[model samples]
Target: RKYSQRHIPVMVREVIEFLKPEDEKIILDCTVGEGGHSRAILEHCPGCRIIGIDVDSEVLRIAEEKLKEFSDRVSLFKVSYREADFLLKTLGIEKVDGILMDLGVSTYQLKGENRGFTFEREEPLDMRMDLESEVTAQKVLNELPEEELARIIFEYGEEKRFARRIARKIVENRPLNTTLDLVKAVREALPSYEIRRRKRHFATKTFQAIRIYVNRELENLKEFLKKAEDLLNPGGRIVVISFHSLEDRIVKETFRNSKKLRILTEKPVRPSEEEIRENPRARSGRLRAAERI
Candidate 1:
């Protein structure tokens, strides 16, 4: 798969219903991967203007091309989503009507064996969404202290007992330079019972944990939510589509903790069976929307 295939946004109709974009409303597409969601919003609300930001300059370039027709309706920026406050302020845009953060790695990052986001492919362990980022998965695997590695895996991956084992194995096999090397380390760490499960890959959790740490996703998200709340206008909606339980938990807890907004989806909205069947990737998707008071 290529970047083009991953450009398809997960949920279009659900976002539209939750946001209810009005004419001339200004919005922020925080993860603007390839502008699928932004394009849809613009098409549905013709007068709406959007500020679309992404950390990956390459993806942003692709988004620019994909959203070029709406040149007058959108502004593009290459920056981390966590920089929402500075980005909005720098644009002289005091507030926005809505903001959307489709969190985590996009299909483009995983589809290409070159990106090293998939375990099935043999690629370098360089899982930096923004190539400019100083940290990479390789650094975490090769350099992190065993205890810190265990903590990352346990906290982000939510794999408790096996985290330490996995980290120990990686430390034993230092200079682990590729996704396959890490995968092997995780396999060796899995208990006999878990090995027999024959369901999800044992390495999935650890990989996710490492990627989150390498990209500082959770930290970035925390900052983004805090800052975005202040940037949104009254009744402005914020929709987040999270693929992992960790991300969903953050979205849920943040909405629950917020005094400035009312949660629209008390329970996250999941893709219908038909929708999931049509786009298998949507199966894990959970969308939560909230409106600022």
Candidate 2:
């Protein structure tokens, strides 16, 4: 299982440029999906060490194996980025020179895992990034009140126009156990003429909403950012790569308003056309960075 082959790290060059990893630097990869970015940093920056953390235990194992060559330089953990301060304290590390948070679902998770991440897939309605997580997308879709579901879709998904209609359809078709079932509900909510005019699939927004709510993604991000400033060494950098507007907005606003950090990227750094052509998933990614003051 070559995880690197499937999970390409988005905006590697841009991340390394902003991070400026150098000799003896201690870096923290908060969402080291398959150790792609961590491995790259280690290779390019001699004598650097990385602590990689991920919520998905399965992916952590893959990352461990992928980074076996750098066994002496890397430490891997199975935990969410929100627990970063605790994890660092356990390791006797007070501060790090750089932190990388690539926020989004990995390609491996979307394609390999039977988690209902993609509407194209006919998998179970379980979208938990951490399998041990109590809440699942199935539970959210089948159990939440219609108004609650609508709010999630509208706020998290940014699909305000169709969120209420979608929620109504989902409630009408109770017990959506599979990805296809939810996809059918979304299709039913949107007219064919409306679907034809859309640039992306109608169900994409709804799925994004469910996944974010089920996993507490936004709340975790806010928590991490609140404490991240204190965890960085002076002049240390924090680079975030987000997939959607909601995540990017949080990163942007946090960076702009932080009194303890200086924004590096005034505007979000986007993936190059070449990179997008190589990895289509990179198309939606935006990278923002800041330096600890």
Candidate 3:
């Protein structure tokens, strides 16, 4: 599939309904990968302005091209969403009408970057979304302590049963340099019977764990959420689309606990069966939204 076709934004209709963008309102797409969501927002609400931010310069370039039609109504930034407060202030915008954060890796990165995001591809183990980031999957695999590795796998990957074993195997195999190398380590760590009994790919959890840690994804999200409400206008919506339980849990908890926002979706909204069938990647997506009080 072409990059544009493959990079479908998850739960787009739900996002539009929840955000309800109108004329003259501003929307911030914090992780505007490929500009799918931002383009949709601009098309759906023609008079609204969008400020799109992304960490990967390459993907941001793709987004720039994809959203060129709306050049007059959009502004693109090559910065992490964690720095959104500064970016918005510099733009002389005090608050936005809506904010969207679609967390995790994008299809473009997994398929195009050779960044070791997928196990099916034999690529270099550099999973840094932002090329400027200091840490990479290779560094984390070879450098972190065994206990820390186990903790990351358990906490981020939610692979509790074999996290320690996987960590031990990774530690034993020094100088792991590629995605396949880590895949082999994970396979060797798990018992053959356990691997055979699994429904999903054995390397899925480990790859996700390493990616999250290398990017400091959870830390960044936490910081962004802490300041998100302050960046929103009263009645402004904040919507998040997350692929993993960890991200969903954070969004849910933050929205529930915050006094400044009222949760719009008591439970996460998932993609319909038809949508999932059309886009398999949407299967894991869960969306949660809230409006500033």
Candidate 4:
């Protein structure tokens, strides 16, 4: 399929309810993949301007086209949400009314050709969301020590049961270059009995662990959250939609810990069955919102 997104924006209906992008305002879309959420926000209010940022420049092109009608009001940037502070400075935007981070792999990224984000493809093990990033799944798999590989899988992927075996299996078969190669390693590491216990494919967690490492997703999210309140005007909203349990915990914990914000969602807003069917990619989606005090 072309870069045109087939999936609806993930968790969009609840996002609107929490972000409430009304009145004269600017919203920073930290992960504006293909601009579906940004477009919805624009459609929700004519007074809103969206500053769309995505590390992937290729997808940014798609977002640009998606949001073309709002050309004067929408601005696109190629940067990580971690750099949102700097980006605002460069654009002379001190603060925005809303900030959104729809975290996790975009549908285009997962289904897109050559990203190595999927095990179904034989693409090279290159999971860098930003193509400019030097580190890749291939580099990490081949260079990291067996212990660290185990650590990443256990910690990041939360594949505690098979991390060590997977790490050993990967190291034993070094110089792995492609998605299939990694998939094969994971399969070999998992015992027949172990496979029976896994709900998804055996290699899914391993791939997720490697991708998280390559993209520095957790670190970026933490850094972004720490600075998020500072970038918001008082009472401004910061919303994050995360697909992983770890990310959700971090977001929840940070919001509760922050002295500057009031949590809007005591519990994360999960996608309803209808909503999930609207964008099946968001079945695991959890949205949390907070307003700066």
Candidate 5:
């Protein structure tokens, strides 16, 4: 089966159990992706409704198609998670029973060579999750000053020592237009099997750094978490599935800092060994759940 179509919605059973859905409970899905989680949630609680949002229109479209069975019980919108507060207000939803944000690139987005999420394929270096955004991976790499580029790579990607060297090399080779070109530049600049082994490709860190920077993923997530607290009802639960450390850290810290919610998981929940074995991409997944006090 295509992995993109098999987004198992990490900890699905746990999410439903914690959410404890009831009749007329409204749920907010901040990053609907393919609607895999929404579908499952609605199936478990037929009376609950969901407002599903996504940054990419294409992803939203796929979710809309996949969730057609839910009909009016689920509403799909093209918007970033940070905009949830506004969307909820517009819909007159004062408080929701549950909220979920699955943060990271979807398998569909990553596997699409034209999407510029992977360096394995030769594609335009345009990594904006929202296609309408003016900024792109190519612009960031080709135009940013070497120092700034290095800072973003090191801070966001956590590539550590080789960040400056890679940034310097990228600046030297101006106008690197494609994913493969950037990958080759990073590989040549590092020239180490160890670095490659640590991150699969020397370029993975760079690509991830650039994409996160362009999409403002961390900033948006932080904003969403801050606003989400105000929108959740007492006893409401929030479930976050983060595919990387940076996103998971934000979720963990926000939950820890909140006075209105109790952290349900002392540590982040991970995918099962069987699930990870079948889908290597799921290995990095982390799930955290919290309930409003």
Candidate 6:
């Protein structure tokens, strides 16, 4: 419970309301970080059982420890949501009652871990969510051509104005090894006015672009969304909480075109100002839900 002080799950009440973890029902949690959402679900729905998966083994271990008190009601696995079907084969779990995906990185990972997700830290540029994966931000920033890197930054980060310039700067500074190194390159790319006028930090977009490419985040979401409804029992539900605009668009478009789902929220849900004040990380969160038709 002490960890709750550091990491309060965003929109906990809203998530539980959307998923409706009914008695004895099973919930599929695609990214259960530190068991925050899973713990909330289990606490509210006493008899509900949870099958949670996370790609990061370190965070998975933390979630396991946190939710161990739930014992028979909680199960944690170390697998990416991209290959969650593996859970079906491994556990013989048929259609689930509900599915939940809390996408993007957590505050804990950004600040607690030194994987270089943040520029404020002088950590190595290793932004792999799954440590087992060979691809890392360091590898991509250091290896990819300027054109390719620019494309990634432009498309993924939505940094249209400065992506090319940023990529050019990155190429000029080769063998970039740390978070600060990339930050330095981005700083050199932008004019002083741009550094002051741009919303958020100057390098936020570049870092996000690299992280998304390295983790294969967007494609992975598409891979899962393509068949999410098939894994749900008829009338069962699925809820997703995404932190970025790109992720929100994919989820919105996917659910809009789904023949097997009835979209529950006409518009995406946003956190209240109260919640945002309590947890600023919740500021960018957007929640969407649908019921299997």
Reference-based lDDT, each prediction: 0.84, 0.89, 0.90, 0.88, 0.82, 0.87
TM-score of each: 0.93, 0.96, 0.96, 0.95, 0.93, 0.95
After superposition, candidate 5 runs with Cα above 4 Å error: 1-8
Candidate 5, 42-120: lDDT as tens digits: 8888899999998888888888888988988999988777777888889887889899877767777877538678865
The sequence of per-residue lDDT tens digits that candidate 2 reaches over residues 236-273 is 99999998898899999999999999999999999887
List the RMSD of every prediction in angstroms: 2.1, 2.1, 1.8, 2.0, 2.1, 2.4
Q: Which model is ahead, 1 or 4, in terms of TM-score?
A: 4
Candidate 1 weakest lDDT stretch, 10 residues:
1-10
lDDT of 1 by residue, 1-293 (tens): 22335446778899999878887899999999878899999889989999999988777887899898999999899888777778888889889999998885766677753767768778999888889888889987898889999999999888867888988898988889888899888888887789788466688788889888888888888877775688889989999998788789889888878999889998999988777656645757899999998
Q: What tens-digit string does per-residue lDDT give for candidate 3 at 1-293? A: 32234788888899999999887899999999889899999999989999999989999999999999999999999988988989999999989999999886788898888898877768999999989989989999999889999999999989879999999999998789888899999999999998999877888889999999888899999889987999999989999998889889999999999999999999999999888877756767899999999
- TM-score pick, better of 4 and 5: 4
Task: Tell me the lDDT of candidate 5.
Answer: 0.82
Leading candidate by TM-score: 2
Native-referenced Cα lDDT, model 2: 0.89
Which candidate order results from sorting by lDDT in descending order?
Answer: 3, 2, 4, 6, 1, 5
